[PDB]
Each structure stands twice: as C-alpha cells, then as structure tokens.
Design a protein around this ligand. Structure first.
Ligand code: HEM
Ligand code: HEM
Ligand code: HEM
Ligand code: HEM
Lengths: 146, 141, 141, 146
C-alpha cells in the first residue's frame, strides 16, 4: 500500500484514538450480524442468535481484539503487508477456505465502525486513506488465492 | 429480500434524513469519488471538486430516489423503472459501483446518525441498498 | 429482476428439461463438487463419489425446487420461504457458492440442450438462477 | 496452475477441437448479452442492441479471436501466467479499469461455450480442469489489482 506521508499521518493519528479493547469486537460483531453466513466460521463461539447476543458475546469481543491487532500490525508496516499477513493468509485461505470477498466486507465494516465512532472527524479524505489500508489488508490476507 | 423488521428499520432510519437529503447524498458521492476514483468515469463532464454545487445537486437526486424506494419498498422494480433504464440500459454501470456507493452511503449515515446506526439497522440498511442496487442494475422491461 | 421475456424463456427452457430435471441436478452437483472442491464442506457426511445414489437423490431435490421456482417465478420469496430458511438461517451458505452451483447448472444445460441454450436463453437462465440465489441467501421471516 | 497429466491430456484433447475462428467471438458475444454492462467497454464496436446483433457483429467476432488466442497462449504457459499476461493485465487494469469480477465471468462464459459445443465430451473432470485454467487466467489478468 502506497500512502502519502499526509495520508499515513491522518490514518495513524485516528488509529491512536481507536479503543484497542472494543473496536475490533464491534467490527467482527457487525460482520456476523450484517453478513450472517460468516457465522458459519464461528460455531465454537457460542451464542450468535440475535444482534444483542453477538455484540455481547465475550468470545466475539476477544477475537475482535486479535483482528484489530492484525490491522494495527498492518499499519505498522504498510510496505510489507504480504509478509506481515503470510501466516494469517495460510490460515484463512488454505485451512479455513474463507471466500476472499468476505475480507473486503470486514474491512468495510471496520470503516463503518470508525465513521460511527468519530463522526465528522472521519472526513472523506480520511476514509479514502483508510480504504487504501483495508484493501491492502484484504489483498494480503487473500495472497494464497492469488 | 427484505424482512418486515428490515422494512421497519429502514423506514425509521432513513426517515431521519429529512431536509439533510441533499447534504447526505452529496457527502456519499464525494466519499465514493475520492475513495474509489474509477467511479468518476461515469461522470466525465461533472464538476467533482470538493463542495461542488453540481455534486450537491446530484446528491439530492440520489437521496430523493432512495426516499422513493422506501415509499415503494414492497414494489420497487415498478417504482424505480425509470432509474433502472437509466443506469442499466443507458449508462451500463458495472454492478461493482453500486456496492461502492452503497458502502459510502452507509459510512455517511454512520457518521451522521450514531444513535440510529445500530448493528440491526446497519444490517437492514445494507440489505435495502443491495435491493435497490439490484433493481438499478437489472433490465426488466 | 426478470423481464417478462426472461420469465417466458425460463419457463420454455426448463419445460424442455422435463423428465431429466433430476439427472441434470445430480450432474450439476457433481460438476460443482469436482470443479470447486470447497463446496464439499457443506456436505461433510455425504457420499460424494461418482454415481453416488445420495448425490443423485439430492440432485432430484434441487431440480424439483427449481421447477417449483419456475412455477412461481412471480412470487419466489413466498414459494421458497422454507428453503431460504434452510440455506440462509440454518446452513449459513456463503453466497459465492450459489454462483458456483448456478454456473454448473448452466454448464449442464449447455451440454445436454445445445440447441435450446441460445444466447438469449442463456442470459434469462443466468438471471433466473441469480434471482433464486438471492432468495435462498436472504433471511426475510 | 498445476494440472495432473490426465488433466493436461484432457484439456489439450478438447482444445484441439475448438474452432479458433468462432469460439472466442461466441464467448465474447455471450458475455455482452448475458452481462450487458460489459458493453460499455465496447462502444466503438457498433450494433450491440439485440443478441442477434451482438453475435453477428464482425468486430465482436474479430476481437473474440484475439481473446481466444490469449487463452490458447495461456494453455502453453500455465506455470507462468502472471508473467505471460503482464502486458494484458496492465491494459485491462491500469488503462481500462475493468472490474476483475468480469474476468471471472468471461472465463465461465467460455466454459459454457465449450459445454455447448462438445456436450458429452465436456465431462465433469474435463470441466474441473478447465476451471483451473480460466481461474488462472482471470487471476493473472487481475494481477495489477493484487
Ligand atoms: C479481513 C481481515 C481479517 C483479519 C485482519 C483477520 C485476522 C485474524 C486473526 C488475527 C486471527 C487469529 C489467528 C490466530 O490466533 O492464529 C483470525 C482467526 C480467524 N478468522 Fe480472521 N481475519 C480477517 C477476516 C476474516 C473473515 C472475513 C472470516 C470469516 C468470514 C474470518 C474467520 C476466522 C476464523 C474462523 C478464525 C479462527 C477462529 C478460531 O480460533 O476458532 N477471518 N483472524
Ligand atoms: C443507490 C444507488 C443509486 C441511486 C439511488 C441513483 C439515483 C440516481 C438518480 C435519481 C439520478 C438522476 C436521474 C435523472 O436525472 O432523471 C442518477 C443519475 C446518474 N447516476 Fe445514479 N444512482 C445510484 C447509483 C449510481 C452509481 C453507483 C453510479 C456510477 C458509479 C451512478 C451513475 C449515474 C450517472 C452517470 C447519472 C447521470 C448523471 C448525468 O450525466 O446527468 N449511479 N442516479
Ligand atoms: C439453485 C440453488 C439451490 C437450490 C434450488 C437448492 C435446493 C435444495 C433443496 C431442495 C434441498 C433439500 C431440502 C430438504 O429436503 O430438506 C437442499 C439442501 C441442502 N443444500 Fe441446497 N440448494 C441450492 C444451493 C445450494 C448451495 C450453493 C449449497 C452449498 C454449496 C447448498 C447446500 C445445501 C445443503 C448442505 C443441504 C442439506 C443437505 C443435507 O445435509 O441433507 N445448497 N437444497
Ligand atoms: C478474462 C479473460 C480476457 C482475456 C483473455 C482478454 C484478452 C484481451 C486481448 C488479447 C485484447 C487485445 C489486446 C491488444 O490488442 O493489445 C483485449 C482487449 C480488450 N479487452 Fe479483454 N480480455 C479478457 C477479459 C476482458 C473483459 C471481461 C473485458 C470487459 C469489457 C475486456 C475489455 C477489453 C477491451 C475494451 C479491450 C480493447 C478493445 C479495443 O481495442 O477497443 N476484456 N482483451
């Protein structure tokens, strides 16, 4: 991913304000609610029967933390997303066989969650920079399909 | 296919747009043109600059079309037939672009309507926009 | 969204399918499992071997469901409500898989009915299967 | 793309029967009929108003011949598709901005045309081998997006 220094600064600044404990869970949760077939990959996570159950599910919140950490790892090394995500790509593609469109969906759900949290501060230029990041992350996750 | 709960959620959430229709529609278009620059190809002679009156005017049209869709949500192909002929027959818009604009509409609503944009309403709005997109990208005359 | 002419094409083509509906459904499933091996994960306990009586039995179910959908092409959500609950609520089938099976059905039809599989009929059948897919991947109770 | 010896033999045997003057035009033509937004990329080709007009259009047939030629070349370079298709990828992605889902659609329309022409010869194992090939070609064409 090629971000301008201005775009990188904008992305980094906002991410510094993202709640490490909650935003990943909010994004993973909304993925499971908005695109219900994704629940099939999370049988062992217990109760996903209603939106409230999903968003309050402790395992969803916990797993979400990991997901966010991976986006954070991506932000730390935008010039090597492929290398950063190589193990995760093997897992999601070769082991789990997640269709790669779902990677795009989760990235876009994260963008919605950032807009929800930050309101007017999530300007169109800030979004455009985040769209480059989440497309890069989705592509890196899908690398074993390519 | 929308559930009764989906229709309830959409009517309630979109109902709060009101006089901000033009503003929100324009913001969603600006987000799309900036985030996904290939979409600009469909508007070759538009002023697509930030704050453009032309985009503002177009935003109102799109938003009003969504209002129309809500008011006819059980019978959308007949209500949107003119828009389908425009987008599918005349302009031949690639379906991917509707996913891009739908996403930018959701982002816009999330940024302006935090109380309304619950996970359930988020899900319903996504389905609604997908249904509208399918109608606008279909040829069914 | 299907045009009036689409519906006529689909009815005419599926009519020609007739008594072979079951054989073709089984072949489409076999094509899908072989060409797109990830789809087999939805049938973990199935005998998926070539000539499987279980796959043949399932192929007939799929074909009969399509015949029902053709018979209710104007009212597919109501006609397929049980099947939608099964695929979208219970099985949680990823929508990509419907594109794969739809393709394999078209391939099966093309192989067996080449005279019937004109470009216009191909187009109408693709739209019909997409419409069925959208209903089966929607939760609308 | 790796083919078993059995798959390679079967793919080659079927391709030898393909009418190279017609099949590409049939595939391209059906793409324009079945997925009508794709016509936007071929505005200069003249009459595309009806399925008969599309299928009998001399420019569709001629262009189709080139497309088929690219698939034929790919069959001889299955281990180096990203290299072979680099120039075509730059054209379709960077210059024309064709959304890559359309590459997948054309590949599958070609498969439908092969089924149409060869019927009982286009067995499920033969189809499976061809799906590997057209997936490989679509992926290589989309490389600039990855
Ligand atoms: C697109 C961005 C995504 C990122 C950054 C991401 C990141 C991660 C991470 C960090 C893990 C934990 C890996 C480990 O502990 O070894 C994980 C596991 C997993 N992911 Fe994702 N993921 C993404 C998309 C998805 C999607 C879309 C799905 C399914 C629809 C999915 C399904 C799973 C599953 C099933 C697991 C294993 C859960 C378990 O331990 O039972 N992932 N992912
Ligand atoms: C929810 C989705 C959409 C809605 C509700 C919508 C609605 C509308 C409306 C109401 C108009 C004006 C119609 C008129 O003037 O009679 C219009 C025009 C237009 N739309 Fe959309 N649209 C949508 C998606 C898109 C997308 C995704 C694109 C392309 C990326 C697009 C490209 C265009 C173009 C090029 C025009 C004509 C502009 C001109 O030259 O005047 N539309 N649309
Ligand atoms: C045109 C599209 C489809 C049609 C018409 C269709 C129709 C059917 C029918 C009629 C049944 C039997 C229901 C019953 O008797 O209880 C069934 C079951 C099932 N379908 Fe589909 N289906 C379609 C697409 C798919 C796809 C794409 C998948 C996954 C790749 C899938 C996975 C399943 C599974 C796992 C079952 C249950 C099998 C079992 O364990 O008994 N279906 N479907
Ligand atoms: C997926 C397999 C595809 C293959 C193998 C393929 C192959 C080719 C080839 C060989 C050319 C000629 C290049 C040249 O003259 O330098 C070409 C040009 C072109 N392709 Fe494709 N293509 C594919 C998919 C598509 C799709 C899906 C579209 C969507 C519309 C598309 C749009 C075009 C256009 C617009 C041109 C230039 C036509 C002109 O000269 O005006 N291609 N392609």
């Amino acid at each position: 991913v090629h971000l301008t220094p201005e775009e990188k600064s904008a992305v980094t600044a906002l991410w510094g304000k993202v709640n490490v404990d909650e935003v990943g869970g909010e994004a993973l949760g909304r993925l499971l609610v908005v695109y219900p077939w994704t629940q099939r990959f999370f049988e062992s996570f217990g109760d996903l029967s209603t939106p409230d159950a999903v968003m309050g599910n402790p395992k969803v919140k916990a797993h979400g933390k990991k997901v966010l950490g991976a986006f954070s790892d991506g932000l730390a090394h935008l010039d090597n997303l492929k290398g950063t995500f190589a193990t995760l790509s093997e897992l999601h593609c070769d082991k789990l066989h997640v269709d790669p469109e779902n990677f795009r969906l989760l990235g876009n759900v994260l963008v919605c969650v950032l807009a929800h949290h930050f309101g007017k501060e999530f300007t169109p230029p800030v979004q455009a920079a985040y769209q480059k990041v989440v497309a890069g992350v989705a592509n890196a996750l899908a690398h074993k399909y390519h | 296919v929308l559930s009764p709960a989906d229709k309830t959620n959409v009517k309630a959430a979109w109902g709060k747009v009101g006089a901000h229709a033009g503003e929100y529609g324009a913001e969603a278009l600006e987000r799309m043109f900036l985030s996904f620059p290939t979409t600009k190809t469909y508007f070759p002679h538009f002023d697509l600059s930030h704050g453009s009156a032309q985009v503002k005017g177009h935003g109102k049209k799109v938003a009003d079309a969504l209002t129309n869709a809500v008011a006819h949500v059980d019978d959308m192909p007949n209500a949107l037939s003119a828009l389908s002929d425009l987008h599918a027959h005349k302009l031949r818009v690639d379906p991917v672009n509707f996913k891009l604009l739908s996403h930018c509409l959701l982002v816009t609503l999330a940024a302006h309507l935090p109380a309304e944009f619950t996970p359930a309403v988020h899900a319903s709005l996504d389905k609604f926009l997908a249904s509208v997109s399918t109608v606008l990208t279909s040829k069914y005359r």
